[PDB]
Design a protein around this ligand. Structure first.
Ligand code: FES
Length: 141
C-alpha cells in the first residue's frame, strides 16, 4: 500500500523534517511557541485563502491555525512542500515576510501555518492524509 511511516521522535521544536512521498517533498515542522501563537493570531478575514486545504478534515473547513495542524496543541504542521503557484519547493526556517516559508521562484510568502499571504500562489500549502499512530510516528497516506 502507498502509506509510509515517519519516525518523528527526534524532531525538536523549530525543526522541519522533509520526507519524499509520491515523488514530492512533505514538510513536517515541529512548530515553536512563537510559530504557534503567531498562527493563532491571524483572523480569517486577513487570509488570501480561507480554505484549510486539509485532506484529513471536511473540504470546506476554514483555514484556522487549528485546522492546519495534526494535533490540538498545534505543534505538528505537516504539508506538501509544493508551492501552489507552479510547484517550486518553498524555503523554510522562518523565511519570507510572514514567519513561514518563501517560494523564490516568483515570490510567494506563506505564514507559520503554511497559509498563502503574498505573491502569485492562489492557495495555502495542502495538507496530506496524515495522522499519528502512536507517540513517535506519523503515517502519511
Ligand atoms: S512556484 Fe512558488 S511563487 Fe511561483
Amino acid at each position: 500500500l502507498a502509506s509510509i511511516f515517519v519516525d518523528v521522535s527526534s524532531v525538536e521544536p523549530g525543526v522541519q523534517l522533509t520526507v519524499k512521498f509520491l515523488g514530492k517533498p512533505i514538510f513536517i515542522r515541529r512548530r515553536t511557541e512563537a510559530d504557534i501563537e503567531l498562527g493563532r493570531s491571524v483572523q480569517l478575514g486577513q487570509l488570501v485563502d480561507t480554505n484549510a486545504r486539509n485532506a484529513n478534515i471536511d473540504a470546506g473547513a476554514e483555514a484556522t491555525d487549528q485546522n492546519r495542524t495534526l494535533d490540538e496543541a498545534g505543534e505538528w504542521l505537516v504539508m506538501w512542500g509544493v508551492c501552489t503557484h507552479l510547484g517550486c519547493v518553498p524555503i523554510g526556517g522562518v523565511s519570507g515576510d510572514f514567519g513561514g516559508w518563501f517560494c523564490p521562484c516568483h515570490g510567494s510568502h506563506y505564514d507559520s501555518a503554511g497559509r498563502i499571504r503574498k505573491g502569485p500562489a492562489p492557495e495555502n500549502l495542502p495538507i496530506p492524509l496524515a495522522k499519528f499512530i502512536d507517540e513517535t510516528t506519523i503515517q502519511l497516506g
